[PDB]
């Protein structure tokens, strides 16, 4: 057993890079996103902090997302969820409050 409360970010995924900085992911959005549906979720290892980042056409956004030190990842204006899997999938449905629903992952795919 190690030291960790709940989930510890899931690498396996495009729009889920628990390494990117924040800009790095927003520059990626620079790449893609047109229909105002691209997004990406990121995590951090400092004090449990996640934030969704989607672009509203040439206007990349970010949304803070955390829990109540309970494990339930939520959002003030956004919503509430168990994990970034639900908050993402859910939001994968709608915006729920975002600028616009989600439709595409930000992160990259290949090289060239």
């Amino acid at each position: 057993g190690s030291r960790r409360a709940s989930v510890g970010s899931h690498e396996k995924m495009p729009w889920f890079h628990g390494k990117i900085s924040r800009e790095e992911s927003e520059q990626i959005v620079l790449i893609g996103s047109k229909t105002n549906g691209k997004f990406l979720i990121r995590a951090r290892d400092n004090n449990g902090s996640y934030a969704l980042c989607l672009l509203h056409e040439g206007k990349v956004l970010h949304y803070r997302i955390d829990k109540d030190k309970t494990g339930k990842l939520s959002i003030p204006e956004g919503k509430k969820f168990d994990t970034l899997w639900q908050l993402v999938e859910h939001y994968s449905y709608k915006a729920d409050g975002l600028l616009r629903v989600l439709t595409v992952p930000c992160q990259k795919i290949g090289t060239q």
Binding site: L52, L61, H62, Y63, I75, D96
Partner: peptide
């Protein structure tokens, strides 16, 4: 840096 959800 967080829009308003």
């Amino acid at each position: 840096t967080y829009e308003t959800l």
